């Protein structure tokens, strides 16, 4: 089906202790493949997935260049926002950037993104039509004016719809065996008594990919979304994911409940019973 | 491919 590429960078100032630290990572779907860390020795864009190690020195040279150029301007950007907001140089601040494109099953452009957040909230972001900016506030509007004058919008539009899309296609191929794999969740129930009168039923899903999954509980074929405990999906640490849903049950009524699991790699929704 | 950040200055 659809796929996505993403770059996330994070710049955090650390006043009186040096230059801001810049960390950037890149993803294809739910898999990281590169990183850059301004405090690292290599001072180059590094590989974080085997299927990208096959790009030659020119890739690394050009990519390093781009990420370095970005890291230096976001360094300067922190300073500009600081002045824009007239904030104290004593405080630490954060600038985050997200960039990338979505493509469809047919490898064709779907959506493009180019957004900044300052101190964890929206600053400026490119709209769905890739033609105009959404400026969160008065300061961002100064920037929206700079970017308008510099034609950043139309420039990035062309890149998203072009360079980014094509690169995504190349990656999906280079890493076909990994990126286009599908991992059904390996499931199972567990039973945990809390009292003589109650017990926890927990439904597990493990080692699945991508991370998109739906886990639901049903008391005799009926939703329990309010009484179900659901943990945020989580990395197994090996490119797969885990998740669990749970309901507290009055003793005796166990067999009343049912666990339902939907995942891309499951031909049909699974149902589990205690 | 990492974004080409010409003009990204605030």
């Amino acid at each position, epitope marked *: 089906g659809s796929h996505s590429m993403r770059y996330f960078s994070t710049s955090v100032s650390r006043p009186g202790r040096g230059e801001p630290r810049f960390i950037a990572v890149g993803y294809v779907d739910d898999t990281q493949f590169v990183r850059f860390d301004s405090d690292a020795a290599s001072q180059r864009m590094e590989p974080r997935a085997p299927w990208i190690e096959q790009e030659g020195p*020119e890739y690394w040279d050009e990519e390093t260049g*781009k990420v*370095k*150029a970005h890291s*230096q301007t976001d360094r300067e950007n922190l300073r500009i926002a600081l002045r824009y907001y007239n904030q104290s140089e004593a405080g630490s601040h954060t600038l985050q950037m997200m960039f990338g494109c979505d493509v469809g099953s047919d490898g064709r452009f779907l959506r493009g993104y180019h957004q900044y957040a300052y101190d964890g909230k929206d600053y400026i972001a490119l709209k769905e039509d890739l033609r105009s900016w959404t400026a969160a506030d008065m300061a961002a509007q100064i920037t929206k004016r700079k970017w308008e004058a510099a034609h950043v919008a139309e420039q990035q539009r062309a890149y998203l719809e072009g*360079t980014c899309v094509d690169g995504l296609r190349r990656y999906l191929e280079n890493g076909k065996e990994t990126l286009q794999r599908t991992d059904p969740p390996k499931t199972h129930m567990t039973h945990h008594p809390i009292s003589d009168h109650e017990a926890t039923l927990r439904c597990w899903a493990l080692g699945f990919y991508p991370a998109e999954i739906t886990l639901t509980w049903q008391r005799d074929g009926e939703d329990q979304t309010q009484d179900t405990e659901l943990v945020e999906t989580r990395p197994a640490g090996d490119g797969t994911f885990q998740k669990w849903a749970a309901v507290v049950v009055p003793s005796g009524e166990e067999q009343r409940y049912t666990c339902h699991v939907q995942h891309e790699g499951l031909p049909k929704p699974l149902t589990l019973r205690w | 491919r990492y974004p080409l950040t010409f003009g990204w200055c605030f």
Partner: T-cell receptor
Amino acid sequence: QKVTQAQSSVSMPVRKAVTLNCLYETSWWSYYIFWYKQLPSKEMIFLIRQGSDEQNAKSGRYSVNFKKAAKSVALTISALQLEDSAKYFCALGELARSGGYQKVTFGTGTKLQVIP
Amino acid sequence: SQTIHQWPATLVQPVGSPLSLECTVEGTSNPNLYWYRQAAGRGLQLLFYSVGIGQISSEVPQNLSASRPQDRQFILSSKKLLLSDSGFYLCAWSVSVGAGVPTIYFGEGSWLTVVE
């Protein structure tokens, strides 16, 4: 070899249109091509630019025929004028490995002589 | 994004004499600066590029010396000219990588004929 302008010299009747060829070599995936016109005074004036992700650039009588696969970026000027007579330069722009600046490389130029 | 001016435009000097070309830009702040060279009247070779005040860099080593004592003040110099220093020297400026897509714009250039 980085930027190649095979035509040392070209002539064309006024009012007609001419095409100045340009080929280039780059291992970058993102880049820009620039066209300049050098006046007989030796003044180097900027004309039009072409980005590797943009449609065919067009600006007044100047137009670029971007053929990305071939890495061909020929300039075409229509409705020639006598003062069009000048030397035309093709240039390649690549973000440096340092990220610090854009390295622009120039071809050797083509003299256009428009004929009265 | 306004004005660039270099001086003097024409130079005739004996071997051994000091050289001092100066360049200025107006209407823009903290621009990228460059010294380019045109041997014959064909290829342009980038000699120096300046990312910011006080900063001078070159791709390949040079005998001519360059400097940037102020944001909008650029210099190409020598303490003793070699007859090989003859040539056409162009000053140029551009927006910085961060400020936009760099498009190099040239000054008028300077003809330097070192005579034996």
